[PDB]
Write a protein that binds this ligand. Structure first.
Ligand SMILES: [Ca+2]
Ligand SMILES: [Ca+2]
Length: 636
């Protein structure tokens, strides 16, 4: 062990006092022993942090079969780097350059050394020292055989920044789990610390300018300086990661807390990226390095997610989004609660309502992303509508402005059609393009054509005890604006006002979709549709137009998860726009108990004038009158 072996260590870091004396005094072997004692001390004093990983390992879960298998195969130098292939024998003196298949991916993913963590967990669980001896043997083997600048092609696979970042993230908890083994010599420690340093620092000078990799790589660089703050360079590493993450959270999330892709599931992924970074720092008291705006933004992203969370823990399947596992979602919230312990709403979601307090609000607008929630409450039997009238997204968004999911008494009545599949060959693309159609969502079309953009302007948003009102306008077609208003009345039901405004002429259609098992009745005499559920939790959708309006079924589908789909009812209210005069639809969306659909009619009162943004209508429901009197626009 040389003087040189300590060059990158900050000897004046708190706790390394003995290590300093020994190096200054010239006995380096005892310096190394003293450093090893400090890390062993630090390892016992805190749990390994796995939480930055895509799938964080659990120290106290029993060893399942694949993990056992992975650890045992590694003892005979068989590794399975790629999931599309099984184990390969890399030899008794390991050959890290072996090309057992002709796929680049097999060589790249080999240098993610995924099995090292497996060995760590099995070593932790059994205590069997053979796992530790082999890992130390293997780390040294790998470091010695794959130095940076070995050759052009080696560095292409071993020192590509994605993989380097993978290793700088997996190694800290792996190290933590092996550091107490008598196989972990003080000589090795120094070999490890200098090899780690080189990687984390290389990462700091090579992270990506553009795209998906940039965020992962910066976050892991930060995780390097958090995990090993003893390096002279760890504060620079942290600042660099923080800077990249802070720059990108400003660019990628709106002031209302929603992530710019407009897909609920991608917003949730983004929370993990930005929160795990901060969480790991906070665990070792380095959170003060993050600016306050970043901490607030992240908290706001969780609240934005909460606002569009339905009672079953799902988010509406807008664009490329799908249903998810409630237990996994609760575990995410519980980890978030750890970061924001004072947040009662987050605690509430973490514990399925047992602890914390319900969020501080009912209906809420996320006005930058254009997600609007109408809710009666947060309980399992609330009525909840989440509606999208957004700005433009990219690949994971669709031309669906107006569409909504309506969840009543434990059931989702109007699930979004969803994704079904991502891009592929021509055959796969037409499967995907079908799901991107405007006409299959709950909004207005002209001649069943896709709207050319989602660029909603919010005309009014107001909440109230027994009235919430949204009004927005979408420039859906070059000569046709679509104005939609939604009134959530008496925390129970909805009046939906759709206006087609401009010069274009053709077939106006307001489309609707229902759950696969709702077995609806289509009633062309009254232009109403109603579900026929045995349990009495039912829904009516009825057109209330004065003028001649038709009711027709159309092909309807829903994909809850990837590459699976179910037929489901869909329909449309249709009416001609012959000239340049505006056409108006009045529709009612009315949940009811029991088996008999209610009789609903409507009277236009004096003062009612949709042209001046004035609504004054009297509904009659099973004989009883409900006055609705509200201005549809604000600031006019
Ligand atoms: Ca990269
Ligand atoms: Ca959709």
């Amino acid at each position: 062990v040389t003087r040189k072996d300590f060059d990158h260590i900050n000897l004046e870091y708190s706790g390394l006092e003995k290590v300093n004396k020994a190096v200054a005094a010239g006995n380096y072997d005892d310096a190394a022993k003293a450093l090893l004692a400090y890390y062993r001390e630090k390892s016992k004093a805190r749990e390994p942090d796995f939480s930055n990983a895509e799938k964080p390992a659990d120290i106290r879960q029993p060893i399942d079969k694949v993990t056992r298998e992975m650890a045992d195969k590694a003892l005979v130098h068989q590794f399975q780097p790629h999931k599309g292939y099984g184990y390969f024998d890399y030899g008794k003196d390991i050959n890290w350059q072996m090309w057992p298949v002709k796929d680049n991916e097999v060589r790249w993913q080999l240098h993610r050394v995924k099995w090292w963590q497996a060995m760590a967990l099995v070593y932790h669980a059994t205590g069997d020292e053979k796992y530790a001896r082999e890992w130390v043997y293997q780390y040294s083997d790998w470091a010695r055989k794959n130095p940076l600048g070995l050759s052009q092609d080696n560095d292409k696979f071993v020192w590509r920044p994605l993989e380097v970042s993978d290793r700088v993230q997996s190694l800290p908890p792996t190290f933590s789990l092996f550091v107490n083994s008598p196989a972990f010599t003080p000589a090795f420690l120094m070999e490890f610390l200098n090899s780690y340093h080189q990687q984390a620092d290389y990462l700091s000078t090579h992270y990506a300018e553009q795209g998906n990799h940039r965020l992962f790589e910066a976050q892991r660089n930060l995780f390097a300086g958090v995990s090993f703050p003893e390096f002279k360079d760890s504060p620079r590493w942290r600042q660099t990661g923080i800077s990249v993450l802070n720059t990108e959270i400003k660019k990628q999330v709106y002031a209302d807390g929603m992530q710019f892709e407009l897909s609920p599931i991608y917003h949730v992924a983004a929370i993990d990226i930005f929160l795990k970074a901060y969480g790991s720092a906070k665990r070792v008291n380095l959170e003060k390095e993050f600016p306050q705006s970043y901490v607030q933004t992240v908290e706001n992203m969780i609240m934005a997610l909460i606002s569009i969370s339905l009672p079953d823990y799902n988010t509406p399947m807008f664009g490329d989004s799908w249903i998810t596992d409630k237990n996994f979602r609760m575990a995410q919230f519980a980890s978030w609660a750890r970061v924001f312990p004072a947040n009662q709403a987050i605690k509430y979601f973490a514990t399925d309502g047992k602890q914390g307090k319900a969020p501080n609000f009912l209906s809420k607008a996320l006005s930058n992303a254009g997600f609007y929630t109408f809710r009666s409450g947060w309980d399992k039997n609330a009525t909840v509508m989440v509606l999208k009238a957004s700005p433009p997204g990219e690949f994971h968004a669709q031309p669906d402005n107006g569409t909504f999911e309506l969840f009543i008494k434990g059931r989702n009545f109007t699930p979004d059609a969803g994704v079904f599949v991502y891009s592929g060959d021509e055959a796969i693309m037409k499967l995907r393009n079908w799901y991107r159609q405007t006409r299959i969502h709950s909004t207005l079309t002209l001649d069943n054509q896709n709207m050319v953009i989602t660029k909603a302007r919010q005309n009014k948003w107001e909440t109230g005890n027994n009235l919430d009102v949204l009004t927005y306008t979408n420039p859906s077609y070059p000569n046709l604006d679509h104005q939609r208003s939604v009134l959530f009345i008496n925390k129970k039901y909805f009046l939906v006002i759709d206006r087609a405004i401009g010069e274009a002429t053709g077939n106006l259609g307001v489309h609707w979709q229902l759950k696969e098992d709702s077995n609806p009745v289509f009633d062309k005499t009254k232009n109403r549709v109603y579900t026929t559920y045995r349990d009495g939790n039912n829904l009516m959708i009825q057109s209330l137009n004065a003028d001649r309006t038709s009711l027709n079924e159309e092909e309807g589908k829903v994909s809850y998860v990837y590459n699976k789909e179910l037929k489901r009812p869909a329909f449309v209210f249709e009416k001609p726009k012959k000239n340049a005069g505006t056409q108006n639809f009045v529709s009612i969306v009315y949940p009811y108990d029991g088996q008999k659909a209610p009789e609903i009619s409507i009277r236009e009162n004096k003062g009612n004038d949709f042209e001046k943004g004035k609504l004054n209508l009297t509904l009659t429901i099973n004989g009883k009158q409900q006055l609705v009197s509200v201005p549809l626009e604000h600031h006019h």
